[PDB]
Amino acid sequence: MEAKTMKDMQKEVDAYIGQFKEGYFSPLAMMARLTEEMGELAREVNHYYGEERSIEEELGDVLFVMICMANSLNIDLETAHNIVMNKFNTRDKDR
């Protein structure tokens, strides 16, 4: 493990977008971008599992737009992950 934090991956994407005059796409434009990326993942999941490198890369593509979305709206995905994990966190002492 190197190992990169979620905070750093977000900083890394923020640094890349920061160079452009355009900046982040508007949230609704982002949502279209995500739908587009998800389609490319769907295509690839269907190709390999329907009726590691390509499918690995299409996840990264989706993850990038997600980070963009999250950065655009000042959302920290580590926090986001934690609130989901807390929702699944059972009150059962045996687990």
Q: Which positions lie near a copy of itself, rule CB under 8 A?
A: 1-9, 12-13, 16, 19, 22, 25-43, 45-46, 48-52, 55-57, 59-64, 66, 69-70, 73-75, 77-85, 88, 95
Name the CA radius of gyration of the chain, rounded: 16
CB of 91 to a copy of itself, least distance (A): 15
- The three-class DSSP label of residue 72 is helix
Q: Which of Mn ion, a copy of itself, none sits in contact with 69, Cβ below 5 to 8 A by type?
A: a copy of itself
- The three-class DSSP label of residue 91 is coil
Residues forming contacts to Mn ion in the complex (CB under 5 A) are: 37, 40-41, 58, 61
Pick from 42, 81, 72: which is nearest to 59 by CA?
A: 42
